[PDB]
Amino acid sequence: VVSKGLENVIIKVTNLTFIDGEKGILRYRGYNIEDLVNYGSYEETIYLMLYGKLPTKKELNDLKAKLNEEYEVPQEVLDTIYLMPKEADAIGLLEVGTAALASIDKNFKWKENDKEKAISIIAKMATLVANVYRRKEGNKPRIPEPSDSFAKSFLLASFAREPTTDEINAMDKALILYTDHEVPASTTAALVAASTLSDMYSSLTAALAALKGPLHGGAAEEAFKQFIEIGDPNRVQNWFNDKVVNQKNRLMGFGHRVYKTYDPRAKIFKKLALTLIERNADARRYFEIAQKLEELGIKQFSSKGIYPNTDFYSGIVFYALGFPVYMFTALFALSRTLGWLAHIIEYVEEQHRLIRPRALYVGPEY
Amino acid sequence: VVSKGLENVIIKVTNLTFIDGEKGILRYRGYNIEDLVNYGSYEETIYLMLYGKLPTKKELNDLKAKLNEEYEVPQEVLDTIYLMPKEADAIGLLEVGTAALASIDKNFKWKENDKEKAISIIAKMATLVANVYRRKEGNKPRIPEPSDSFAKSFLLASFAREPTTDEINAMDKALILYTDHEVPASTTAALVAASTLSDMYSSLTAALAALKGPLHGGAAEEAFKQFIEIGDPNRVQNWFNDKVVNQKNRLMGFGHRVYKTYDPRAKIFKKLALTLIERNADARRYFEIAQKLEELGIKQFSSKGIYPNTDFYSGIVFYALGFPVYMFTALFALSRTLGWLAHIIEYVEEQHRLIRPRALYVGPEYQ
């Protein structure tokens, strides 16, 4: 008898992420996310995830130097992306890019130096995401160059404009907030690839393969698309009364299968939206719309334990830095790449078992 | 509490493949392998797997026509494959090609025309496989042309040499024989992708990424490699006595999770190899090493319920048709693509659920 969706099945133990949905607490190796965003950066979160402890000043410096040495990608990886249609789905192009890398990285060996490898993949993930954007906007490639931070190099490479401090911060916290959460289908499929001892690019490919589906990718998009549909802050009430109240639909970006309280990263994402809305007028138009909705939603649903989740405001942040709605999932993927690599290493390094489930034959035997 | 490897977990129910590991019975939709390799083609197996029954004579002819209309692949996919290193692993190159096709295919919708779409994918996989081979040997790309069969089409594309009945037959039976078997990491990864409703080319990319691990792909290559190590039939006993007997090595091509008898499709694989080794003097030499090694092996491990499995002979058929050792898992992938499509289709149309397993958080409460 089928264990439907694997819902009640534990695929692995993890030392990586802990979520308390009663309280609304998210931790990475024991540290609350709020401490990480309040005092740290993406770089220190990478170190934590991969190596287990907070890095020394010299240990963090060393990570940062590896990252600076690894943004480059063989030209063939950029050429392939540019052979695909400009109109192609961002996640589909990420797929091709990661599959290409897989294929060029002949001579990889599990357990030799996994952590360093992962660091070089994070650096190259930045390069593809930047160029996936550029390629869909018709621009020539641009490769992240060394800088004081990973958020800065990525933004530099994307837009070719000197980002403001607030922009560097928004993108850096963004990266930490989405690093890991649960084991959705993208992590599962990565875990499945990795249990056959496949390379890390191939597991990311498989993770990206699952993320392309609409039941996994598009969360931020769909939430964000509500605001566009509203258009004007003055139309929120009629929209909410109609759609929500008496037609009984969902508030996309509300609710959660673990959180019974505000999502800890929705709190942080909103705050970052406030720091960037001054500069983009569309971004500010959607924040006022989104902020009117949230008050209407909390009055309506908090009594049933339904709160704004992380996708209600992360789109406004991304939109406010200049990324088009078609890149939200790919920005999620950039960030989630850290989580996925940690799960894979962790799996293969401490609790390796090939994955071979079973199907039950039904219908006639002869 | 953890279901290590997902071993005793029933991920889905299925009407596709039934295995009896005591009796050695392998059937597809109720039909024994023997009846299909004996009497029909790979095309008939495509129809049965996808539509659920045997094709009436014209049903099979339309499918055939459908295949024939679908070998062409956009030049960008081929350019992509030709942009990677010729020394790349072949599964890797396949992954690139399926990803390239997934992102070019912006017009896809589950539950509209799955079967027709799967048919169109099977044919493009033949082109992919044919051209991953050409690129690794350094030749210009060649696209399968319409013909009386898919095996004929594929061999022509591959070698650009007209194949023979025996050849067309061996390729075509190979395809039926590797179509489906259990739910390994490749099918599982295809299910996980399809559970989010990703596209079919993307689910294949997922399956192909998992297939590349050395713990899933490379089986037929490990069996055949042993024979090459031996070199000549006059050394079998020394090597056998050397490596296996006293040094307790693992005979490769022997052993099974489910079959504790001889693998049914190994039995047919051997026959197919007898059928083409006349032609290939190099094949026969390897076939003679193989046949003598099976003999000692069977003598050594039959009591343990360890008999030759399907990977012990397949390499010889593929080698006899002209494919190098590096194409082996790719040849399997070509075959198993059918099984992958039927499984995700069965899954999305009848048992659709999104996959979200649990992780159990052990690890610092609050550092």
Curated annotation (Swiss-Prot), chain A:
GO terms for molecular function: citrate (Si)-synthase activity. GO terms for cellular component: cytoplasm. Keywords: Acetylation, Allosteric enzyme, Transferase, Tricarboxylic acid cycle. Its EC number is 2.3.3.16. Pathway: Carbohydrate metabolism; tricarboxylic acid cycle; isocitrate from oxaloacetate: step 1/2. The keyword Translocase does not apply. Pfam families: Citrate_synt. The N-terminus is blocked by acetylation. One of its GO terms (biological process) is carbohydrate metabolic process. Allosterically inhibited by NADH. The active site is at residues 256, 311. Belongs to the citrate synthase family. Citrate synthase is found in nearly all cells capable of oxidative metabolism. This is Citrate synthase. It comes from Saccharolobus solfataricus (strain ATCC 35092 / DSM 1617 / JCM 11322 / P2). The gene is gltA.
